[PDB]
């Protein structure tokens, strides 16, 4: 948790409903945006902060919280976009007799700033003496070790927690239907909204350009961004009646 791993996620397409519906995660509640509607919103860069804590302080992974972990290992801002995924890892992160690789900042000089990294294992100064790099009275090691057993209580078990923080490229999935031919549809291709019937065409589009156009510019032809075939667009049958 003190060497919390941060991954930049940029220039891709992110899927968030697969994380929401997996049901393998014990705590999944989101601040700033609902988990359903953060798939149709999107951002510039996505930060994934992964660590392993004890499960009894998972309330400390929240905006504006107090405790050892929130103030000395990983601090959240109050204006936090993104949220927290928490799930048990007792069959992997906990070993019989104690898995002690995971450490946390028990002592520090002050509280953290939001998103601050601390790796320094310099000897702490509880009192007043030159500790000079060695351990002794009031000169403690600032990191305390997690004790993980497979026989302990459920909140006193190792929990994997990954926090996603938001801030424009990283935008999610997109699909609705099939393509619909010879019927009046009010289509939406990449953002261009038009109404008309889509037909098989003979217009040999060159491989780079996307959609057609004519004299007195109207988007009369389109290639789909989907399967790459060519579709005429005809206006939807608008004649007057007498």
């Amino acid at each position, epitope marked *: 948790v003190y060497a919390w791993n941060r991954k930049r996620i940029s220039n891709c397409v992110a899927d968030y409903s697969v994380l929401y519906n997996s049901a393998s995660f014990s705590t999944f509640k989101c601040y700033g945006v609902s988990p359903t509607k953060l798939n149709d919103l999107c951002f510039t860069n996505v930060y994934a902060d992964s660590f392993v804590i004890r499960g009894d302080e998972v309330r400390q992974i929240a905006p504006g919280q107090t405790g050892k972990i929130a103030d000395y290992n990983y601090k959240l801002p109050d204006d936090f976009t993104g949220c927290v995924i928490a799930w048990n890892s007792n069959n992997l992160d906990s070993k019989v007799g104690g898995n002690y690789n995971y450490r946390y900042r028990l002592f520090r000089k002050s509280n953290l700033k939001p998103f601050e990294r601390d790796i320094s294992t310099e000897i702490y100064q*509880a009192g007043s003496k030159p500790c000079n790099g060695v351990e002794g009275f009031n000169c403690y090691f600032p990191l305390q070790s997690y004790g993980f057993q497979p026989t302990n209580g459920v909140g006193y078990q190792p929990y994997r927690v990954v926090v996603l923080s938001f801030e424009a490229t990283v935008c999610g999935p997109k699909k609705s239907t099939n393509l619909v031919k010879n019927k009046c549809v009010n289509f939406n291709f990449n953002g261009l909204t038009g109404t008309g019937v889509l037909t098989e065409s003979n217009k040999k589009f060159l491989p780079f350009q996307q959609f057609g156009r004519d004299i007195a510019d109207t988007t009369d032809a389109v290639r789909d961004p989907q399967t790459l075939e060519i579709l005429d667009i005809t206006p939807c049958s608008f004649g007057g009646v007498s």
Partner: antibody
Amino acid sequence: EVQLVESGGGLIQPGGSLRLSCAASEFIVSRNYMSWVRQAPGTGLEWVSVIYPGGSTFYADSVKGRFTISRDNSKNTLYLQMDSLRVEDTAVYYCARDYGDFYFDYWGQGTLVTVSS
Amino acid sequence: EIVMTQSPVSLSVSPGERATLSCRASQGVASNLAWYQQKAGQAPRLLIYGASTRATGIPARFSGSGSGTEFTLTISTLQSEDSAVYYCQQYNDRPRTFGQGTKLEIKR
């Protein structure tokens, strides 16, 4: 020199208010982890409150809302203001330096408060 | 919370008999126990931390161990300065509850 010398005890009415102090020696009150503990006869030694570097004030569920702690940063002193004292609050109060929230490293001499009619 | 109970609440033991003190923890803690000694009008020192380690200057007389629901402190040769109050305290549950005290004296 490790010293934790305490003051503020005395006889008060049930329903009165008083104020404690714990002068510390050679270490910082506002930057170390310490705790207020009580001992009464017949009952065991009991944790009341704990206070962090800056941090948060953590109380017992029995005394939550009644006691308050306000450390004063002019010197190495730790206070506790006692309001709405019940009849069961006859105890000697100790300021004890902790190793975070694990174990009591050092203790004071305690100041004993007796509340009665 | 863990409410502490000392079963040998008062034990009068000859000057050197390897006396046995104990407590039970009403909940399940693995080895989360520390043993304390309060002398007469003095500061209550720690004796044992983690239920298996002697902290600082704690001799080989003290062989306290135990787990889960039964914890036992062993005092070996019993100088008269060990006639004191023996506490046992857990690490796991907030709020922290001390032991009720074991009154050990040496018969003269």
